[PDB]
């Protein structure tokens, strides 16, 4: 029976975009969707269709990483290896000091008391949180609402908390410290409520990660199928048209382009490389890097935006930095993926781990050249073995259960945990 | 199993919104639903979440009735009353005449053949189209897919079809002439289809209408809850203070004022009787109503726009048109409803259900007064049989299955139907 579910996200839009499908999925079933994030994503928030809620204020943070010019990949934001042979107690806890200090409370700090406060309010029953945004747990405990993480992320971040945890145990009494612990534990020791470990990794789970691809590890967890969302979407009428050679799909963005830097492969090259070969090209890029082109090759067709589940149905290959979006609708699609990137968030990852079942190809961004560029498309073009491993990982994700599906799980589920 | 979904609508804003959370019920269980209409509603597609097509071209309609200043309502329009005992045969061959004319064709010409070229391409399995978007089905048989009407509508679309072919049948052989066959007979001729009366009221309704205030019918009929889309929302801070005293809304557009006109109460003159009352007032106003104002009441507050699904909850009257929006948000919220109208499309019907159950007050627009308001206001606020009324179609709504709910039925009414 009816529900009023608070769905909470840091003010990324790409990161909002990956929970549409499910809040979309609740509201169908009769329950009140509300989503919250900074004022800066109330825009996007608005054009999903979901009803915005905008608390706290606006956070420097992507006004910093695009006047940067530079790259974001750093040994200890790297948490592409959590396992406990790569990290001694010391590199643990201060991968957790630095990820609390400069990323997670810039993004949460802004907004967690006027997210408690809007829950107090509205009494939400369930708290469906992105991964990192503690911001929701926080609040969805002080009214004592069910709460559960959505992933877009192969979860680096609950298994570098179980590495950390592990070592957290081996230590003596008086040098035991939490970063995690701290923080969260300050904002809800303000509202009489103490610290628990649910609130670092939900009380359960929704995964929309491949059970085949995600790393195993100790939580309720809840398989959710993939829908593309890929923000606001047209259809252009040059689609009708099927290419007659394989298609080759390139995507940048403002997100891409303010993490990998200005020091790796130029755009500019990697249209260059493409233009030379017997494909068609699509090159989805931002503005700035439409100007930096001398001549668009003949093969090739350049846009702002266009939605890849409409575009990417018949594509050959998807030459993209490894967000979500990009990899979840290729992968839905069938299409092989090629993923020159870095060590940042899940991106290295979402790389390797088509790469290890033989899907897609991985390279670090700083060995990316015009040969092996032309090599890795001309492979996942050529050699089939790429199109039938993407094929069966399509065929895994169609075996998931839907955000439909899965509606009567989380009314039980809050039913169980909530108030 | 899985379907391409095309929702086919006119060039409202209005009637897509009604569509959302069916089309998101759809998207949510793993299928593709993409929304077809005139380019001028791309931007309005593309805000609900929904992957926008745009077919055709504009029509002149709306920067018609919007430079009118003058009412709608005419006798030959007016289908607030489908009986045959109100329609010789002549009356209802002429009302057939005069919509599929001046609106039916105006509406879906400008579309038609590229939507039907649209679904030639993409081979929807099914067209889920608005009531009077007959350029709808007319795609859908060219393709052999299922489809259905989707109602926001008290159906007197489909009661006057069938006065119309009940005094059809009473007509010697040489003088049948049916507009809506030769109409879209027409088209479908033109692809080598012939016409077949599916094809003015769908393979099957599903209808958002409360079953105790629809009309009854001869059709394959899936009730359907209710679930309200007011277009892009967000919450404002002043929402969270309760208001002391009954809040009473009232809702004027750029719709709503290009169809009643100019003749009748000014809205001025409505906001400063209700500004004299002992209510909280807000008034949700177009910007070229909002300067026409010389001071606005110590009790009311104006806004542009204001989500009514948020609003409503704990209000204590709507005052509108009786479009269907503003209808089914103040039903789902229990609030009683004044709603002061014409015989324009099933506004006087919206009213007059509501009137006839006890949950409400119609009036025709012709007759509002500042005493005829007060008193209305005042009733719906004060008699108890208004609200009591109104919480059982709440309930009733709230029994009716959701769009989750009836995804298998609209799946196996496809497998059906068509091809
Ligand atoms: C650039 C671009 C992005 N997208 C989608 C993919 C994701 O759902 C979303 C952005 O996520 P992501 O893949 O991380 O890229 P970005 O750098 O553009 O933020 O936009 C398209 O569908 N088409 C495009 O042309
Ligand atoms: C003006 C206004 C409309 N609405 C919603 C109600 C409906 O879902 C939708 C359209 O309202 P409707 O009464 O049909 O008006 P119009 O034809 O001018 O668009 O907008 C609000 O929620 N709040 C407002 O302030
Ligand atoms: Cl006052």
């Known amino acids: 029976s009816h529900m009023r579910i608070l769905f909470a996200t840091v003010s990324e839009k ?23 994030s900074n004022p800066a994503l109330t825009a996007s928030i608005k054009s999903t269709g979901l009803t915005a809620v905008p608390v706290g204020k606006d956070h420097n943070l992507h006004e910093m990483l695009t006047e940067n010019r530079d790259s974001l990949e750093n040994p200890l934001s790297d948490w592409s290896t959590p396992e406990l042979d790569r990290h001694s107690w010391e590199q643990v806890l201060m991968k957790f000091k630095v990820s609390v200090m400069f990323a997670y409370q810039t993004y949460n ?12 309010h509205w009494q939400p029953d369930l708290v469906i949180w992105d991964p990192v945004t503690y911001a929701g747990p926080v609040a969805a405990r002080v009214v004592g609402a069910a709460h559960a993480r959505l992933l877009w992320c192969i979860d680096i971040y609950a298994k570098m908390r179980e590495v950390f945890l592990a070592r957290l145990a081996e ?15 300050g904002i809800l020791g ?11 990794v939900g009380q359960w789970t929704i995964d929309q990660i491949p059970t085949s691809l995600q790393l195993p590890l100790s939580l309720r967890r809840v398989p959710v199928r993939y829908l593309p969302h890929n923000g606001p979407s047209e259809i252009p009428d040059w689609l009708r048209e099927a290419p007659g050679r394989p298609r080759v799909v390139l995507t940048s963005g403002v997100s891409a382009r303010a993490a990998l830097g200005g020091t790796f492969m130029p755009v500019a090259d ?12 699509v090159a989805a890029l931002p503005p700035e890097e439409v100007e930096a082109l001398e001549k668009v090759p003949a093969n090739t067709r350049i846009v702002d935006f266009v939605p890849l589940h409409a575009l990417l149905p018949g594509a050959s290959v998807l030459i993209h930095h490894g967000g979500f979006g990009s990899w979840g609708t290729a992968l839905v699609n069938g299409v092989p993926q090629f993923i020159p990137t870095i060590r940042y968030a899940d991106w290295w ?8 079942a033989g899907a897609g190809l991985v390279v670090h961004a700083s060995e990316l050249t015009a040969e092996v560029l032309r090599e890795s498309v001309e492979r996942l073009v050529e050699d089939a073995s790429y199109r039938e491993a993407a094929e069966r990982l399509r065929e895994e994700n169609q075996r998931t259960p839907t955000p439909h599906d899965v509606v009567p799980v989380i009314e039980e589920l809050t039913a169980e945990h909530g108030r």
Chains 1, 2 share one sequence.
């Open 14 to 36: 790409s990161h909002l975009f990956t929970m549409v499908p499910l809040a979309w999925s609740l509201a169908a079933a009769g329950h009140e969707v509300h989503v919250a």
């Open 109 to 120: 700090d802004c907004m967690v008391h006027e997210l408690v406060d809007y829950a107090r």
């Open 171 to 185: 230590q003596p009494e008086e040098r035991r410290e939490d970063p995690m612990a701290d923080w969260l534990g």
């Open 190 to 200: 303000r509202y009489g409520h103490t610290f628990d470990e649910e609130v670092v």
């Open 270 to 281: 990697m249209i260059n490389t493409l233009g030379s070969m017997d494909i068609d090209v």
């Open 349 to 356: 990852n979402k790389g390797t781990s088509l790469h290890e």
